Every structure is written in C-alpha cells, then in structure tokens.
Amino acid sequence: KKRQWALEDFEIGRPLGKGKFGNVYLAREKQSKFILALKVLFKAQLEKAGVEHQLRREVEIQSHLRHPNILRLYGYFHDATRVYLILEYAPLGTVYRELQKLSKFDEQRTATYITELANALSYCHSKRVIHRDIKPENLLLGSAGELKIADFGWSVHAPSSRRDTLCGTLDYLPPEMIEGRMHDEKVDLWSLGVLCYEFLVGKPPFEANTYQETYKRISRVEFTFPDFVTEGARDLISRLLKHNPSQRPMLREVLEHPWITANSSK
C-alpha cells in the first residue's frame, strides 16, 4: 500500500488451513491490532515446481481487486526462506466445510451463493481477469455469511491459451480447458454451473473414480440430476453446462434467471 511489512509486525495465531505449499494462519498486526490472515509459502517449495511466476500473477491480480465478494490481498513480504501473503480474514471458513457439514444446501442458500459469486465474477470479468479455479475449497465466508472468492492461484487474463498442467481434479474445468484449447471468461460460467450443482446435490456433476473417466464425462458433458433437483435449478445448470462456450449465458442472464430470482435473498 505504501510501507513494507515484516514478520515481526505480526503475532501469528491458530492454523486456518494446512496445504502443500503453505499454511494459512490467523494473525494480528501488532500496532493497530488489526486481525487478518497470513498465508505462509515456503519458497524452496515454490522454487521447485517453478511456481514463482504464477505467484507474481496471483498477487498482482488479487491485490488490485476491490469487491465485497472477493477476498482482499493487502500486501506481501518475504524473508530468506519464504513468502507471506497478507489477506483479509474470512471468519466463517470455507464453503467446502459448510457443504461437508450440511451435505447439501437448499435452493435459497445456493441461489444466494450463486448470486454473490456471479457479482464477484462480473467484476473480475469487467477486467478480463478469469478465475478458472472456482471450487468450494476456494470460496470463503465473511462475518455475515457472504461468499468470498478467495484463491486466485490459477487466475489469468482473458483470452488465454495457457496449457497449464492440471494437477487437482478436473471436476470444475470446462471442455476447452481440459483439452488444452484457448479460453475466455466463459470458463467461469461453466464452473458456476458445476458449483450450483455441487451445492444442491452434494457432489460435483462429473464426479468419477479416475481422472481419465472424469475427463470423458466433462468432454461429453454427461451429467444427470437426482429427483430432488427442481426444474428451475436443472434449467439454470443446463444453460451453464454447455460444451460450446458461446452458448453459455452471460452473468447478467444468470443474475436475472427466474430460479435465481425466486430463491435468492441477496
């Protein structure tokens, strides 16, 4: 923002999450007593794996975004053995944990999350910033329970052709991405459809036992609905999960979808 931070400026608290590259800790800035989240990345581990570039992007992109449904990146610093990301702290945790707790959400909570996410993505896209990694593990919850897009690790500017090695599951990736083709903002609209389905059903629509199998379901767009998913929900999800990118709706149409309108509270 202006000044340069150091570890000594923070009292680290309890672990929020422990991952492959780093951990996320609750932390408080000594002087102002400001409560935030500190993501500690080991570096050597970054240096291996050649991830140094993506991190500059993630930080560069996320630190320049200001939206109520987008977790903020206030700044960063490093030392000899690692890098620190100073993030806004989301008090209610991940959407993933909420989902794992309730099993599945009702139409109202889902419609509200989709809405908040569409606004968030609407803002990102107004900057040709495509997220490409929308999944429940990357969505946090604010003090009022509002959804916050949180992890811009795989974020890039559109249009892009980046053939990045897909390491996690392909569960949220669209056909154009799992096939190494060029892609734009429509990628996020597919993820949104996958997300809407996971929220209501409890499992992503293309889930399978092998990467290779999931790959097939995605490219062929083979998904079915359990009896309890309603017509309006099936409808929105079907418009979003279109193999042809140009056929997926605009976030505006999503926000104005009858089902998103009857059930959304936000």
Ligand X SMILES: O=C(O)c1ccc(Nc2ccnc(Nc3ccc(C(=O)O)cc3)n2)cc1
**Nearer Cβ to ligand X (138/264):** 138
Q: 146 — phi, psi (to 5°)? A: -80, 150
Rounded Cα distance between 207 and 53, Å, is 31
- Which of 26, 171, 151, 36 shows the shortest CA–CA distance to 94? 151
Beta bridge partners of residue 67, listed in sequence order: 70
User: Environment class of residue 208 by beta-carbon count within 10 Å: exposed (0-12), middle (13-18) or buried (19+)?
Assistant: middle
Name which of 116 and 185 has its Cβ closer to ligand X.
Answer: 116
37 part of the interface to ligand X, by CB under 6 A: yes
Answer for which of 5, 9, 13, 17 binds ligand X (CB under 6 A) is 17
Start-to-end CA distance of the chain, whole Å, equals: 31
From candidates 90, 114, 134, 189, binder to ligand X by CB under 6 A: 90
Contact flags string 164-193 toward ligand X, x per CB under 6 A: ------------------------------
What's the min distance (Å) between Cβ of 54 and ligand X? 17
> Does 18 appear as a known binding residue?
no
Tell me: is residue 96 an annotated ligand-binding position: no
Q: Does 140 contact ligand X by CB under 6 A?
A: yes
Of 106, 158, 107, residue with least CA distance to 131: 158
User: Measured between alpha carbons, how far is 105 from 146 in angstroms, rounded to an integer?
Assistant: 14
> Is 16 a residue that touches ligand X (CB under 6 A)?
yes
Strands 73-78 and 83-87: antiparallel
Beta carbon of residue 239, minimum distance to ligand X (angstroms, whole number): 30
Known catalytic residue at 133? yes
Residues 92-111 that bind ligand X (CB under 6 A): 93-94, 97
The distance of closest approach from Cβ of residue 209 to ligand X in the complex, given in angstroms and rounded to an integer, is 23
CA angle, residues 243, 178, 201, in degrees to nearest 5: 65
Q: What share of the chain is helix, strand, coil (3-state, %, to 5)?
A: 40, 20, 40
Cβ proximity to ligand X: between 16 and 118 the closer is 16
**Position with the least CB separation from ligand X:** 17
Nearest Cα neighbor of 138 from 154, 126, 122 is: 154
Choosing from 87, 173, 192, 254, the residue that interacts with ligand X (CB under 6 A) is 87
**What DSSP character marks residue 49?**
G
Contact with ligand X (CB under 6 A) among 84, 89, 105, 113: 89
* Catalytic entry in 106, 133, 227, 235: 133
Catalytic residue ranges: 133
Annotated binding site: 20, 39, 88-90, 137-138, 151
Applying CB under 6 A, which residues contact ligand X?
16-17, 24, 37, 87, 89-90, 93-94, 97, 137, 140, 150
